[PDB]
Structure 1
Amino acid sequence: DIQMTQSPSSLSASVGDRVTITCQASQDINNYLIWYQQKPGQAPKLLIYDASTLETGVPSRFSGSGSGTEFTFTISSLQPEDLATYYCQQYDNLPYTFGQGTKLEIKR
Structure 2
Amino acid sequence: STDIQMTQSPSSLSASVGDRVTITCQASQDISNYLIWYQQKPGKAPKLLIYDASNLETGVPSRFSGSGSGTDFTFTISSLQPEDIATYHCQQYDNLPYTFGQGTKLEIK
TM-score by length of 1: 0.95
Percent of pairs identical after alignment?
Answer: 94
Question: 1:101 deviation in Å?
Answer: 3.8
Distance 2:80 2:12 in 1: 15
The residue aligned with 2:39 is 37
Long gaps (5+) in structure 2: none
Q: Figure out how many residues of one structure are paired with residues of the other and give that number.
A: 107
Aligned counterparts of 1:68 and 1:11: Cα–Cα separation in 2: 26
Q: Which moved more, 1:97-106 or 1:28-37?
A: 97-106
Structure 1 portions without partners, runs of 5+: none
Query: Cα distance, 1:44 vs. partner?
Result: 0.3
Runs ≥4 in structure 1, deviation > 4 angstroms? none
RMSD (Å) for aligned C-alpha atoms: 0.9
Deviation at 1:33, TM superposition (A): 0.2
Listed one character per residue, the Cα deviations across residues 24-79 of structure 1 (whole Å, up to 9, x for unaligned) are 11111011000001101101000011111111111011111011211100010101
* Distance in 2, Cα, partners of 1:62 & 1:51: 12
TM-score (norm 2): 0.94
